[PDB]
PDB file of C-alpha atoms in Angstrom:
ATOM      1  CA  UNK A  53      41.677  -8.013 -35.244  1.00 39.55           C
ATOM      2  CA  UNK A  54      43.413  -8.011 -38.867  1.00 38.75           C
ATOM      3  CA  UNK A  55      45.118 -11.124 -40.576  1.00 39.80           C
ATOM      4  CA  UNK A  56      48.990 -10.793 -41.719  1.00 41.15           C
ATOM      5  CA  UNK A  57      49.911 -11.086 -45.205  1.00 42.51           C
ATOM      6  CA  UNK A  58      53.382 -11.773 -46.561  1.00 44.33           C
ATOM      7  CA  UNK A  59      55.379 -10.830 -48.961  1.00 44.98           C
ATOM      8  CA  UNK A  60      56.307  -7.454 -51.513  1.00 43.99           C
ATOM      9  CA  UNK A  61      53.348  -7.797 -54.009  1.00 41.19           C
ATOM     10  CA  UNK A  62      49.769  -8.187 -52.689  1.00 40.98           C
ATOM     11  CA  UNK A  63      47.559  -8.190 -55.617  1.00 40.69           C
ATOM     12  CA  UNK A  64      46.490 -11.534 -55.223  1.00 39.25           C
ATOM     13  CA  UNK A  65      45.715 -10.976 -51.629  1.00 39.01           C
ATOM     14  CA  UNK A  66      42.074 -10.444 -49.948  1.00 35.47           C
ATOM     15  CA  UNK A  67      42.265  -7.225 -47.443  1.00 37.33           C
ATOM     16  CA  UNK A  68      40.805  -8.198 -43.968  1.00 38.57           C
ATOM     17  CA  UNK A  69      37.205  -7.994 -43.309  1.00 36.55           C
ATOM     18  CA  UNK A  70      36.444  -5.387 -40.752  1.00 40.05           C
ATOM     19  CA  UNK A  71      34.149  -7.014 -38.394  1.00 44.35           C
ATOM     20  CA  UNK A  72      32.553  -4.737 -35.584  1.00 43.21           C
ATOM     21  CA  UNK A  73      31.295  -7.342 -33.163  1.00 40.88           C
ATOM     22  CA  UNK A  74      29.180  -6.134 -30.175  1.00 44.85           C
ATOM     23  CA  UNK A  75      28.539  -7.764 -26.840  1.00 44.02           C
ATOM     24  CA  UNK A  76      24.891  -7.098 -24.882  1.00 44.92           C
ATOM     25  CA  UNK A  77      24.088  -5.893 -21.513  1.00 46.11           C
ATOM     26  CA  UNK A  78      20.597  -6.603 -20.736  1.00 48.14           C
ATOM     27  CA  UNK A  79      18.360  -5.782 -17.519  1.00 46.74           C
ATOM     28  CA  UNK A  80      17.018  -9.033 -15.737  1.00 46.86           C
ATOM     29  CA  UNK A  81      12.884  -8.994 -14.848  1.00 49.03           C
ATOM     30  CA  UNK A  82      13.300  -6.437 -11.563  1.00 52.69           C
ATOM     31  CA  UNK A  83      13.242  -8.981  -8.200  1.00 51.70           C
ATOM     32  CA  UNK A  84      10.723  -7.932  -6.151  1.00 50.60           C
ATOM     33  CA  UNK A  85       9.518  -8.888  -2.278  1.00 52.30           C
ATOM     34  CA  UNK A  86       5.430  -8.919  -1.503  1.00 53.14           C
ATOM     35  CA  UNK A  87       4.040  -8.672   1.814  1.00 55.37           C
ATOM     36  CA  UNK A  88       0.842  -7.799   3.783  1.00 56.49           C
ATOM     37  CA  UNK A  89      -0.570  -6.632   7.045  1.00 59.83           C
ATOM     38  CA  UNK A  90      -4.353  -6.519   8.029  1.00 60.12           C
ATOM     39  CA  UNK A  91      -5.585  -3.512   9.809  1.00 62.43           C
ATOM     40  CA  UNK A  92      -5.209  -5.106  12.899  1.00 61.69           C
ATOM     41  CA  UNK A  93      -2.011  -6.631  12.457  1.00 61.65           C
ATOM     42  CA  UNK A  94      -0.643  -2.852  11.203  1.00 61.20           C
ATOM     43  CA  UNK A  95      -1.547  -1.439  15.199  1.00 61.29           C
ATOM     44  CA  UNK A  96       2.146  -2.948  16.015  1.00 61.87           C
ATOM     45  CA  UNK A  97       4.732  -1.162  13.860  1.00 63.21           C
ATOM     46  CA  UNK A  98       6.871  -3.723  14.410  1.00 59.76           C
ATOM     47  CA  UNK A  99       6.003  -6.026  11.873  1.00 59.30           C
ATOM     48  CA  UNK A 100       6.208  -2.928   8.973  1.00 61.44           C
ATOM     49  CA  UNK A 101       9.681  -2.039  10.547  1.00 60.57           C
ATOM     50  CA  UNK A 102      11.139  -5.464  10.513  1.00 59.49           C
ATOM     51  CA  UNK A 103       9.884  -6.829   7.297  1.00 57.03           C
ATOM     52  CA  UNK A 104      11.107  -3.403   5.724  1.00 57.45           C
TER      53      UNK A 104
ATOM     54  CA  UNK B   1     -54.512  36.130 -13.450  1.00 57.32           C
ATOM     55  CA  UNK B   2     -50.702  37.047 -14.624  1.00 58.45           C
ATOM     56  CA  UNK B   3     -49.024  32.861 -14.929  1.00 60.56           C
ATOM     57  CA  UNK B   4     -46.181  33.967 -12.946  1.00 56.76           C
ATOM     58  CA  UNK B   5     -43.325  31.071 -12.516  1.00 58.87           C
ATOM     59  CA  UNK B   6     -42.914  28.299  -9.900  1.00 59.57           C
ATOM     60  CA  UNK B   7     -40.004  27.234  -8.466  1.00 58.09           C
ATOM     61  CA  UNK B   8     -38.592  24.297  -5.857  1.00 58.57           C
ATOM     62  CA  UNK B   9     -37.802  26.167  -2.658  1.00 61.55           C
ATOM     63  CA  UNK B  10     -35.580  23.431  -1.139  1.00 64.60           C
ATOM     64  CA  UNK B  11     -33.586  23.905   1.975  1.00 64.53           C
ATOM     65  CA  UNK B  12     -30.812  21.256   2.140  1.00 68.00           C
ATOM     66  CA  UNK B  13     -29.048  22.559   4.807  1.00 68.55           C
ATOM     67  CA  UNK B  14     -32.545  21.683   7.311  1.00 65.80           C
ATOM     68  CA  UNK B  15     -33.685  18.624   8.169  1.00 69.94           C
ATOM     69  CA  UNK B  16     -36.222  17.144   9.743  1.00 68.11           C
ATOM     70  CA  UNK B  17     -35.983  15.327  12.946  1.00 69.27           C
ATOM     71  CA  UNK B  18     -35.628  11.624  12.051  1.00 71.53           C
ATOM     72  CA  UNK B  19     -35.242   8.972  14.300  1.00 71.58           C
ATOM     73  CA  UNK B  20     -32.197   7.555  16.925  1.00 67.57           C
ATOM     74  CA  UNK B  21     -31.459   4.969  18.462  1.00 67.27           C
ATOM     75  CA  UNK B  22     -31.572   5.919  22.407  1.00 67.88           C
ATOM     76  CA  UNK B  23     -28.027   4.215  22.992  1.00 69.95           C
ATOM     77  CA  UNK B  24     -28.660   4.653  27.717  1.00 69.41           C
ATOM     78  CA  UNK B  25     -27.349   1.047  28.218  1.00 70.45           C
ATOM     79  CA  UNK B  26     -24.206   1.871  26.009  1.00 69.65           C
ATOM     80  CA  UNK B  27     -24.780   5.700  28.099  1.00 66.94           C
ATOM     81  CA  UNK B  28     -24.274   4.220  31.606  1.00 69.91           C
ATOM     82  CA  UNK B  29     -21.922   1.061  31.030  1.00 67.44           C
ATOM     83  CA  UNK B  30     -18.385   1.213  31.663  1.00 68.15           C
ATOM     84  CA  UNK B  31     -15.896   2.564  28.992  1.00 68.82           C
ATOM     85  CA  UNK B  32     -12.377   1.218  28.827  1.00 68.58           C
ATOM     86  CA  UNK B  33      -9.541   1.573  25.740  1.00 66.53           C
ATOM     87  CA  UNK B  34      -7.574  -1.005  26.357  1.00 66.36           C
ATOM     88  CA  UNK B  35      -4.618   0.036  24.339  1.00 63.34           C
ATOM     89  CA  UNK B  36      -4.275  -0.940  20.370  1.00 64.53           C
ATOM     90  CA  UNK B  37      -0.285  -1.995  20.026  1.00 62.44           C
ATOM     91  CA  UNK B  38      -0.774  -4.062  23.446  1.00 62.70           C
ATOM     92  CA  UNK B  39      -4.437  -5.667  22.234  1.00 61.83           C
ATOM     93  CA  UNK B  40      -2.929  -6.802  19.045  1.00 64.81           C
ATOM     94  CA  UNK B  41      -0.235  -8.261  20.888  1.00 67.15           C
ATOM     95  CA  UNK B  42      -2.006  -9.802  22.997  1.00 65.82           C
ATOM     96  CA  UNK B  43      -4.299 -11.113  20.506  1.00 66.66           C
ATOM     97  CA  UNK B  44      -7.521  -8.895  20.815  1.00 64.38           C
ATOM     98  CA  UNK B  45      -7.988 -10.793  24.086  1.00 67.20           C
ATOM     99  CA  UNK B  46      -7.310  -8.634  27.885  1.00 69.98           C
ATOM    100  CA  UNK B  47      -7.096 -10.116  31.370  1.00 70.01           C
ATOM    101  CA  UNK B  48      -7.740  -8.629  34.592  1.00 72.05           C
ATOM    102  CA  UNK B  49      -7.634  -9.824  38.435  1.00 71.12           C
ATOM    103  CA  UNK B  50     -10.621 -10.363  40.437  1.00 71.19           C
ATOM    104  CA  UNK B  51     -10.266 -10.026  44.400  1.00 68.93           C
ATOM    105  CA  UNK B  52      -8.616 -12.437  46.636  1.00 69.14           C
TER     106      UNK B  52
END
């Protein structure tokens, strides 16, 4: 973005300050789900195929 | 004499004849697999009838 100036003679005039501002994109901590089945809980494949 | 070298003459692949348990109760009972999806289920419990 630039300022206007006015007038013929600009020798008393500041130019404008190039500013090159930058905006971040940023991973969150990864979401996660946790569970467990016990070795006799795993004999019905249900439970893996549902909570999957 | 001529001090000719000794050596360990070991044969791993033989063994000797140990001892086992004789397992003729276990031999002679009944055998049954239930069925593992259906026992856990169930709740590692299994009912059958008697005889009217």
């Amino acid at each position: 973005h630039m300022n206007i100036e006015e007038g013929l003679d600009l020798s008393s005039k500041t130019p404008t300050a190039l500013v090159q501002r930058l905006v971040p994109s940023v991973f969150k901590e990864p979401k996660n789900i946790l569970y467990t089945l016990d070795a006799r809980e795993m004999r019905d494949p249900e439970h893996k195929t549902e909570a999957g | 004499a001529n001090q000719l070298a000794k050596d360990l003459e070991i044969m791993f692949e033989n063994y000797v004849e140990g001892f086992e348990a004789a397992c003729v109760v276990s031999r002679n009972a009944k055998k049954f697999r239930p069925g593992d999806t259906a026992m856990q289920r169930a709740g590692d419990v299994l009912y059958r009838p008697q005889h009217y």
